[PDB]
Amino acid sequence: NQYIVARPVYSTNAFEENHKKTGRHHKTFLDHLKVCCSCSPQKAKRIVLSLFPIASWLPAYRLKEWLLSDIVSGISTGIVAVLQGLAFALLVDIPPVYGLYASFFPAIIYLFFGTSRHISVGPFPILSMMVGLAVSGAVSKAVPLLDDERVRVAAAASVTVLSGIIQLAFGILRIGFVVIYLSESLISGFTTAAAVHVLVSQLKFIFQLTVPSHTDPVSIFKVLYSVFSQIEKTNIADLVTALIVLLVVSIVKEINQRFKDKLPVPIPIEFIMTVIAAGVSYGCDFKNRFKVAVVGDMNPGFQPPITPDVETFQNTVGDCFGIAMVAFAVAFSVASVYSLKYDYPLDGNQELIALGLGNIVCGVFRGFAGSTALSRSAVQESTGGKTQIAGLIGAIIVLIVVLAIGFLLAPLQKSVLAALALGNLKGMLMQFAEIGRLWRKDKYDCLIWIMTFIFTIVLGLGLGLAASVAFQLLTIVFRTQFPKCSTLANIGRTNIYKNKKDYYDMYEPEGVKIFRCPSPIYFANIGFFRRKLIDAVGFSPLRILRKRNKALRKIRKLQKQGLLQVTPKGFICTVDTIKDSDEELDNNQIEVLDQPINTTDLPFHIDWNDDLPLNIEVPKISLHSLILDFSAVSFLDVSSVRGLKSILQEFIRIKVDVYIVGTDDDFIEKLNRYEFFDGEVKSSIFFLTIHDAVLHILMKKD
Amino acid sequence: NQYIVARPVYSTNAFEENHKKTGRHHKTFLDHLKVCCSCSPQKAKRIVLSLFPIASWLPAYRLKEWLLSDIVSGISTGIVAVLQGLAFALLVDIPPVYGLYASFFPAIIYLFFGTSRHISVGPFPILSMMVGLAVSGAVSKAVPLLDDERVRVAAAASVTVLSGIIQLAFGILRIGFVVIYLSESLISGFTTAAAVHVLVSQLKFIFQLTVPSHTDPVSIFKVLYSVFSQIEKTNIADLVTALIVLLVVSIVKEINQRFKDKLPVPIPIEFIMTVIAAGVSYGCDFKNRFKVAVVGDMNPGFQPPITPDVETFQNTVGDCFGIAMVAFAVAFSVASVYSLKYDYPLDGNQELIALGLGNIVCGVFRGFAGSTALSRSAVQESTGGKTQIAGLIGAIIVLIVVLAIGFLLAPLQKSVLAALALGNLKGMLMQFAEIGRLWRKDKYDCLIWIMTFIFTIVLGLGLGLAASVAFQLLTIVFRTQFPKCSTLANIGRTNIYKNKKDYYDMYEPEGVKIFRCPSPIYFANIGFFRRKLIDAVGFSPLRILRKRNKALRKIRKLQKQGLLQVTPKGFICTVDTIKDSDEELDNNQIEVLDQPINTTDLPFHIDWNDDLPLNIEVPKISLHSLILDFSAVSFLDVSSVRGLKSILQEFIRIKVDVYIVGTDDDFIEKLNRYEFFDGEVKSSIFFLTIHDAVLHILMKKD
């Protein structure tokens, strides 16, 4: 009910003098350098454990309650992984057994080095499209059938190895916090545009048409044109099969989600549809009757290791950087969801290390890159997976297909694989609804979403990302560019001060002005700040100083020529007459008017706000005190320290007292480093609050 | 000296109900669209006078006091113009007579459309190098001695016309505020690196050696190799002539600065040295005796209008954007200084329009792009120039040489022109001391300087600028990435609250925590802010909620089987001892532990902090209230609003009250737009200050 206070009036210097301050030590780099080197016995044990996490989670396995659960989940995820690997290999434009290699090797590495316990490691569509684009370019710029397929495989393997190297290097240097530089709106726009890319790139398998290997910019418009200019040659059986598979798979997917609790396990529609399709095609000999395109024969076995090509490294460095960034971001975002739901910790540097090692091994043995998909991870998590033993069981399923029973997938058509790939794009395609929500909530975020979408659609998936990050950085300057400044007044005859234009019956003490800037002051808004302050007080102090210096010159002259009395009472001007004329100052002597006024020579004080003798006129002002509220100024830079110092000096040379209030102890400490305080500008201008400053002023004048 | 206050405790809602606000009207773009095109009489003249500024300053011209001064200034500046123009043409690699054209046309245009009264319009060293690079690129990409020269002249004219067009478009669209995007630290680094490029360029003329037209990246290193791989073919006479001219000018240059007042006029050393040099080279026949290179014969007269090449426009679009921006930035900076010294207003949009028109016309008549040189402008200003009339006298001097006296410059060597261009580099080279100064003052600005320098040396002048602007934007995120958060306490038994670790004898009311974050909270630091708050309070509220929900379920199990009576007065626990049973919820039903607790079924209150029956265990907490100080938080974004809601809701389910203090009225109005307030989070959580909230809590818990 009551707010009652009685204390003294405090400036920052006065407060510090009366209250003992705790001694603090400023840590030194050489001393700082020393902590890591020690390597005491106990420290060594923990650093090794961090690098090889399996040696910590495996001996604590709850066999009785976690073993059966992992086996059921492993069998379901391995089946899904085989099919997705075949389809994504189709997306990278090579034979489809390399997708099996890409589903096998990185999961085996992640079993030993990873920190997440719920994700499924392998390829996903956006990264496969990016790898295919990078591979087209390297081939074109390689200074001078099946030979063509031998060149594409080699280039894909080299790109994978280089991306893995970059990831591992970033993980060793402890830079795992680079994920903070991508906001949510950027990622939403990027993934919606990439879903449109993936949709367009599947049309050549639903129709069975032949399309060249276009490259960016405007890659998507070229592909669309190539397809419809030859629309008459569409194979009909492929189209009908694809439509049936899409239709049916989409319906069963909705049923699962709606009745989630009722069903013991989710229904496996993708496996069922594949069995029937393969069987009908083989049974009815679709390949020789309707001329459909099938998977064909695959060589049963792994390939021997190869060596990466330095020529390829030179031509694809920029693309590899983009691939590493996208892979890490997606995997980290997906892993974060599960860690929060089950409460366990997650280490980003170790994730970078593990993904890099996995990618390096896959490329050496002929695979392509990938981190994790949200759809396969949801399948693993939904069917009860507890740990990564589910991933090992899925990899064993993949191995059985690679070595023993790969011949059963020979009569399957590419239309069915394309239809499955298209059925997993509903989530990313519903993100278009974000446009209406962001428009109403926040307009800068709506702008980021739209710009990202257009850059990604018009430019490629590699350049669009860089352009989008740059534009997202520019919006931060857009936010703080023209801050909304104001004048404050007293409301209620207490210690409360608010905006002068919002309430009835406000009060302003005579001769005092209070100004507030609600933002940091850096190189991009110091001119705006100066212009607003000059508009707030009503005049320019440098003009007043020049006009005062000028009038002083005229007084000094008349005095020496015998027309001015120079009596203690005032300037008598014995010869009433005078002539007004401006002593023209040349270009090399006009700087004298900007100097501080010294009147020690004349025996009486010269009021500058009262009439001067012999018809000499200067503009008059009613202000004697100015208060600056800096409660919302977070930081300053060299540009702003320079601009601020010149503003204050000008006010002090015309006799106006200045004050700064509302700042913490850390702010003032930094100011000392910039060499801001000197004879003219002292540290005695800082006070704790606005009310403290007003009370001090009233006592001084009175 | 007493601060005495007696008032009521206020929450934001309560304050607003006792003080009547003022009528406020929301901004409406419909009116803005409508009102701007008033098309009134008084408004229409104002626009015409704005566009054609000469109609305003010429009528009111002080003939007695300014006419003699302008003529003296004009003659001095026209002489320097002829010499610099011939020199800059060598940098562009075209015949010398074209630099004379570039010094004549834009000044004539700037007479009518400009707003500045003290600058010299024409070509400068850095811009000339940028154009030369652009021409080389264009020639190397066109579809397949004098003829080669013919090709270079045409390409230079086309680039100039296009750059002028871009400047004009920006001016009409009112985008004159683009100068704010480049900081003083970036500009200093860029100019120092640029000067080094110019020094290297001169070497071929000083030694008289032949060098191929290299292109970026790493263009500077290539030229150096070419020069010293043939240093034994160096002409000695040329080198000796250059060294002497450089030695003499640098000295007389200092005297002007040392004895500035004792001189009625500055000594014209550049003109004197040229007359003596040419006169001696002519009488001694150096060309046929020592084999020195000379300017040679020039055709007397102008060229006919020529049309631009569309193909050239297509190959140089990126280059043209760089030229336009740099030209405007340099000119605006130089003109800003004199506007301040002489107190007159400058329009940014009109300057873009005037410069754009001058560059277009010059290109049509075969000249190259330019803006203003500080060294030439200093000459016009220091010799008494008053207005743009001085700019016109200089152009008439240029006309005389083109039309009538060009032939007296035939016997002059290129070594002397190169030596003059080098004697103006001293101011730009000295900018090297900024490294130590900025290192002492502020390290982010030192980093900006060094990165700009390195990017400009290695990548050249066009790409280095873009890379530097991007890095300068990234430093802003570097500044606010890891904010220094803290816990506050009461010091002195009054309304003052400071850092808990800085003073002796501080006080903390029990069950209360006060947390402060001194920065805005956007997508880049929201994750960091959450971790720090959880470290400050000492626990995680979601873990506490899950364990409570968990103990409640166990209690319910026993109650249903009759082991626990749960009568009104107290739990009865008829079965004395029990054995710990665990439910082990599966993946699909686990989220149930995150809900709000409802205990309505049990007729009595349950105190979580008090001990529970049958050895059930839940972690205990001491905190009952939390205060968040948001005075230095300037803005929020969609990512931080979502993040903050989650935290506030979690604290409220475990029964901890939350308060937000220190915000302004606008801040609160923005929050409503993001749909922040609902039935659990209410607007009654906002208070005016920290002391207001602490007093409210103590009364309540009383």
PDB file of N, CA and C in Angstrom, chain A residues 323-356:
ATOM      1  N   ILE A 323      27.119 -27.915 -48.114  1.00  0.00           N
ATOM      2  CA  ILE A 323      26.592 -29.229 -47.758  1.00  0.00           C
ATOM      3  C   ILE A 323      26.838 -29.531 -46.281  1.00  0.00           C
ATOM      4  N   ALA A 324      28.062 -29.282 -45.803  1.00  0.00           N
ATOM      5  CA  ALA A 324      28.363 -29.523 -44.393  1.00  0.00           C
ATOM      6  C   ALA A 324      27.462 -28.700 -43.477  1.00  0.00           C
ATOM      7  N   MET A 325      27.275 -27.414 -43.800  1.00  0.00           N
ATOM      8  CA  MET A 325      26.430 -26.566 -42.960  1.00  0.00           C
ATOM      9  C   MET A 325      24.995 -27.087 -42.882  1.00  0.00           C
ATOM     10  N   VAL A 326      24.391 -27.393 -44.034  1.00  0.00           N
ATOM     11  CA  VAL A 326      22.993 -27.826 -44.039  1.00  0.00           C
ATOM     12  C   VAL A 326      22.825 -29.130 -43.265  1.00  0.00           C
ATOM     13  N   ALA A 327      23.729 -30.090 -43.486  1.00  0.00           N
ATOM     14  CA  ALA A 327      23.624 -31.373 -42.799  1.00  0.00           C
ATOM     15  C   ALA A 327      23.652 -31.198 -41.286  1.00  0.00           C
ATOM     16  N   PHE A 328      24.628 -30.428 -40.781  1.00  0.00           N
ATOM     17  CA  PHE A 328      24.725 -30.267 -39.333  1.00  0.00           C
ATOM     18  C   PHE A 328      23.489 -29.585 -38.760  1.00  0.00           C
ATOM     19  N   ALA A 329      22.991 -28.536 -39.424  1.00  0.00           N
ATOM     20  CA  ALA A 329      21.831 -27.819 -38.895  1.00  0.00           C
ATOM     21  C   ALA A 329      20.618 -28.736 -38.753  1.00  0.00           C
ATOM     22  N   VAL A 330      20.304 -29.492 -39.808  1.00  0.00           N
ATOM     23  CA  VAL A 330      19.121 -30.354 -39.770  1.00  0.00           C
ATOM     24  C   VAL A 330      19.255 -31.412 -38.673  1.00  0.00           C
ATOM     25  N   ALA A 331      20.410 -32.089 -38.627  1.00  0.00           N
ATOM     26  CA  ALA A 331      20.583 -33.148 -37.639  1.00  0.00           C
ATOM     27  C   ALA A 331      20.455 -32.616 -36.220  1.00  0.00           C
ATOM     28  N   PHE A 332      21.069 -31.468 -35.946  1.00  0.00           N
ATOM     29  CA  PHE A 332      21.028 -30.881 -34.612  1.00  0.00           C
ATOM     30  C   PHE A 332      19.624 -30.485 -34.183  1.00  0.00           C
ATOM     31  N   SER A 333      18.856 -29.913 -35.098  1.00  0.00           N
ATOM     32  CA  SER A 333      17.493 -29.505 -34.810  1.00  0.00           C
ATOM     33  C   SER A 333      16.600 -30.694 -34.453  1.00  0.00           C
ATOM     34  N   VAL A 334      16.702 -31.776 -35.217  1.00  0.00           N
ATOM     35  CA  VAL A 334      15.947 -33.007 -34.981  1.00  0.00           C
ATOM     36  C   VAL A 334      16.330 -33.697 -33.660  1.00  0.00           C
ATOM     37  N   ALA A 335      17.622 -33.749 -33.370  1.00  0.00           N
ATOM     38  CA  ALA A 335      18.135 -34.346 -32.135  1.00  0.00           C
ATOM     39  C   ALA A 335      17.699 -33.584 -30.880  1.00  0.00           C
ATOM     40  N   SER A 336      17.616 -32.263 -30.984  1.00  0.00           N
ATOM     41  CA  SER A 336      17.200 -31.402 -29.881  1.00  0.00           C
ATOM     42  C   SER A 336      15.784 -31.700 -29.436  1.00  0.00           C
ATOM     43  N   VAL A 337      14.897 -32.028 -30.363  1.00  0.00           N
ATOM     44  CA  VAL A 337      13.525 -32.346 -29.997  1.00  0.00           C
ATOM     45  C   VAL A 337      13.447 -33.535 -29.035  1.00  0.00           C
ATOM     46  N   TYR A 338      14.130 -34.625 -29.365  1.00  0.00           N
ATOM     47  CA  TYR A 338      14.162 -35.830 -28.531  1.00  0.00           C
ATOM     48  C   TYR A 338      14.860 -35.718 -27.177  1.00  0.00           C
ATOM     49  N   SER A 339      15.940 -34.951 -27.117  1.00  0.00           N
ATOM     50  CA  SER A 339      16.682 -34.750 -25.877  1.00  0.00           C
ATOM     51  C   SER A 339      15.839 -34.047 -24.800  1.00  0.00           C
ATOM     52  N   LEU A 340      14.986 -33.128 -25.224  1.00  0.00           N
ATOM     53  CA  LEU A 340      14.082 -32.409 -24.340  1.00  0.00           C
ATOM     54  C   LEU A 340      12.906 -33.276 -23.838  1.00  0.00           C
ATOM     55  N   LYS A 341      12.360 -34.129 -24.699  1.00  0.00           N
ATOM     56  CA  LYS A 341      11.252 -35.006 -24.383  1.00  0.00           C
ATOM     57  C   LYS A 341      11.661 -36.105 -23.410  1.00  0.00           C
ATOM     58  N   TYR A 342      12.918 -36.540 -23.439  1.00  0.00           N
ATOM     59  CA  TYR A 342      13.370 -37.617 -22.559  1.00  0.00           C
ATOM     60  C   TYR A 342      14.417 -37.211 -21.523  1.00  0.00           C
ATOM     61  N   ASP A 343      14.743 -35.928 -21.485  1.00  0.00           N
ATOM     62  CA  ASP A 343      15.701 -35.351 -20.534  1.00  0.00           C
ATOM     63  C   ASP A 343      17.125 -35.913 -20.422  1.00  0.00           C
ATOM     64  N   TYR A 344      17.918 -35.776 -21.474  1.00  0.00           N
ATOM     65  CA  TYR A 344      19.320 -36.192 -21.434  1.00  0.00           C
ATOM     66  C   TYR A 344      20.140 -35.113 -22.139  1.00  0.00           C
ATOM     67  N   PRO A 345      21.438 -35.034 -21.853  1.00  0.00           N
ATOM     68  CA  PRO A 345      22.236 -33.958 -22.478  1.00  0.00           C
ATOM     69  C   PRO A 345      22.773 -34.319 -23.855  1.00  0.00           C
ATOM     70  N   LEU A 346      23.124 -33.278 -24.610  1.00  0.00           N
ATOM     71  CA  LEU A 346      23.541 -33.384 -26.006  1.00  0.00           C
ATOM     72  C   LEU A 346      24.751 -32.482 -26.220  1.00  0.00           C
ATOM     73  N   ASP A 347      25.799 -33.014 -26.847  1.00  0.00           N
ATOM     74  CA  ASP A 347      27.034 -32.274 -27.085  1.00  0.00           C
ATOM     75  C   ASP A 347      27.205 -31.999 -28.575  1.00  0.00           C
ATOM     76  N   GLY A 348      27.325 -30.724 -28.949  1.00  0.00           N
ATOM     77  CA  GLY A 348      27.372 -30.367 -30.361  1.00  0.00           C
ATOM     78  C   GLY A 348      28.704 -30.641 -31.033  1.00  0.00           C
ATOM     79  N   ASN A 349      29.809 -30.407 -30.325  1.00  0.00           N
ATOM     80  CA  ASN A 349      31.127 -30.663 -30.897  1.00  0.00           C
ATOM     81  C   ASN A 349      31.324 -32.142 -31.194  1.00  0.00           C
ATOM     82  N   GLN A 350      30.839 -33.009 -30.309  1.00  0.00           N
ATOM     83  CA  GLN A 350      30.932 -34.440 -30.555  1.00  0.00           C
ATOM     84  C   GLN A 350      30.035 -34.877 -31.709  1.00  0.00           C
ATOM     85  N   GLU A 351      28.893 -34.214 -31.899  1.00  0.00           N
ATOM     86  CA  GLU A 351      28.055 -34.508 -33.059  1.00  0.00           C
ATOM     87  C   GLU A 351      28.781 -34.176 -34.353  1.00  0.00           C
ATOM     88  N   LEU A 352      29.447 -33.022 -34.392  1.00  0.00           N
ATOM     89  CA  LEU A 352      30.251 -32.680 -35.565  1.00  0.00           C
ATOM     90  C   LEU A 352      31.337 -33.721 -35.822  1.00  0.00           C
ATOM     91  N   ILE A 353      32.033 -34.151 -34.769  1.00  0.00           N
ATOM     92  CA  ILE A 353      33.091 -35.153 -34.920  1.00  0.00           C
ATOM     93  C   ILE A 353      32.538 -36.452 -35.503  1.00  0.00           C
ATOM     94  N   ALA A 354      31.429 -36.941 -34.941  1.00  0.00           N
ATOM     95  CA  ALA A 354      30.872 -38.225 -35.355  1.00  0.00           C
ATOM     96  C   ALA A 354      30.356 -38.185 -36.791  1.00  0.00           C
ATOM     97  N   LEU A 355      29.630 -37.122 -37.149  1.00  0.00           N
ATOM     98  CA  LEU A 355      29.121 -37.017 -38.511  1.00  0.00           C
ATOM     99  C   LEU A 355      30.253 -36.887 -39.522  1.00  0.00           C
ATOM    100  N   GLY A 356      31.313 -36.148 -39.180  1.00  0.00           N
ATOM    101  CA  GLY A 356      32.452 -36.052 -40.077  1.00  0.00           C
ATOM    102  C   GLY A 356      33.132 -37.386 -40.323  1.00  0.00           C
TER     103      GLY A 356
END
